[PDB]
């Protein structure tokens, strides 16, 4: 049962999304719209940014937690952002979830948040065979 | 079945993959480790950036019955930067997971990659009720 | 039955061969001698310059049906320089030969020509066991 | 039986061969990748430099050799370029196996080690008739 | 069952590992090679430099099992360099085994940690008898 | 058999022991003791410098044995240093146990001699699974 989050602050462009139990957790989401001629035609590519924010306390202290002892703070961050032409959302989906896999393989099951990289990792296109 | 990317340039922080039946493929990841302890602790960081590049033609002319017709591309690009400690991976994994849930909730099946914000969206935190 | 080439230019140390049929396919010899004697000995080298040249159409679009289509030319090039002393041409055939074998290795069917190199790949010396 | 030959440094797009029995005696491969947009794509063209180094001793004590007389060296060197876009590799290969025919008309079984032009020699195309 | 190592950072001519669960545990290995000059003789020399690196916790108190781990680690290093000519490595190999056998000697099996120099050792060349 | 050697210098902190045979062969051992300060803390770190000299005879040439030997030995030297408190000695020759490991792999059984550098090479920390 993940927690609501309610957004904060509103932009046409931008929402920014904060938890109501824990303030210092924020989603936030900033459109940009811009017209490209690539081909004599103003294609309507969009820059999406997304960010992820925790307030992380590290105080690794290792063996045992006693009393209050003041927490530290870290920042847990996490930035994505999508540039594609509206033209070919659907296409734009499908880099996205190939994205999310590629990523997986070495974040999410790999060693690369351990800052360790597997030169034989299974990475592959969203393009079919 | 999806298409095996294979490694063209590589460094021990970086490493670039490509697909070997196209190019314009890629999807590369860079890591920099830094060491920013707070006072009396120990603290490294670890800033992963995942990149994904597809060069797309932009979406053939729909009322058409042309024979063969392809014109220039469009570049799809998604960068993805994860900054956390290593000793609180385990949690920042969980981030991982709920920031792409949080995502997909606009991108994935909303009208965020149309220029489109639904601010009655169910945004949700890692952390449990 | 391959289509003879033609010398066009002509020259007592260089000639340039074409293709009747097809100017935009060249290959050249060009040669130049010089006594770069050691002590106590004579020593005349023979750098042996050999280029050929393709003029190819870029690969036509794939998913194509139009009747007929050919775009502009690719560059293909190709350059050889051999360079040794005459009194041992015998064995400069040999490295020759084994030159040959090597490159055959890497780009005749390894992935060299693609930008990919195999590091296990079974490299010899024209030298015996 | 030609000897193995075992990589002594390597390169994304560099290895460096070299004999271990005659570390003297190399073979090097080196890549360069170029984006050219000849006909409005940038067409994958691709320069690999391969080279071969043999270090010759070239008394040329004629009649006869006696004792230990301190080698004297000759370099004997063989530097290939093959440049070609990608796209086409497969007729790129095509004109590396009549670039070696041709060469070998001239070098291997005519007088252009010797420093000799037949102008009459029988050079090819690697199109068909 | 020792832990798996794995490369940080990496050049051509130096690689440094760590330790996946403890980075401040470093192995690294540097080599350069030169060409050398003898009467009557061309070898190359390559020299390697070889650093372990561990931040040991200082020794235990005695008795008193604090309630969270507070230990002041201090660094421990060992460094090997090895050098002489890519011609002669057989018998190079041959003094790294007895130059391991002197080192156990008096450091392994002697006051190597106290740092007495027992000038009674049984220390022996790579020479047989 | 190996060839047992005296110490023909020393120094209550220098000894250097030589071959009867052949005095050019050499192994020194040289230890320097300082006191280590650290927070809640006081331990000395001792400071060891081992170096072994050949005076190996430049590889034979070949096909000839001259009326007498002219060889022009080269300086083949290998030099460890090990440094670490002498309160932590126990664990400092598990690391000296690891270190000669991994320098067996890249040096013993991999290109040492060549200075290639392995980089899938298995590397291990003295830490255990």
Chains 1, 2, 3, 4, 5, 6 share one sequence.
Not at 33 to 58: C, D, F, H, M, T
Not at 60 to 67: L, N, R, S, V, Y
Request: with cysteine.
């Amino acid at each position: 049962a993940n927690k609501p989050m309610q957004p904060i602050t509103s932009t046409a462009n931008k929402i920014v999304w904060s938890d109501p139990t824990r303030l210092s957790t924020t989603f936030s989401a900033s459109l940009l719209r811009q017209r490209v001629k690539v081909g004599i035609a103003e294609l309507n590519n969009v820059s999406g940014q997304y960010v992820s924010v925790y307030k992380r306390p590290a105080p690794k202290p290792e063996g045992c937690a006693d009393a209050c002892v003041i927490m530290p703070n870290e920042n847990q961050s996490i930035r994505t952002v999508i540039s594609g032409s509206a033209e070919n959302l659907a296409t734009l989906k499908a880099e996205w979830e190939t994205h999310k896999r590629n990523v997986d393989t070495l974040f999410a099951s790999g060693n690369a948040g351990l800052g360790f990289l597997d030169p034989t990792a299974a990475i592959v296109s969203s393009d079919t065979t």
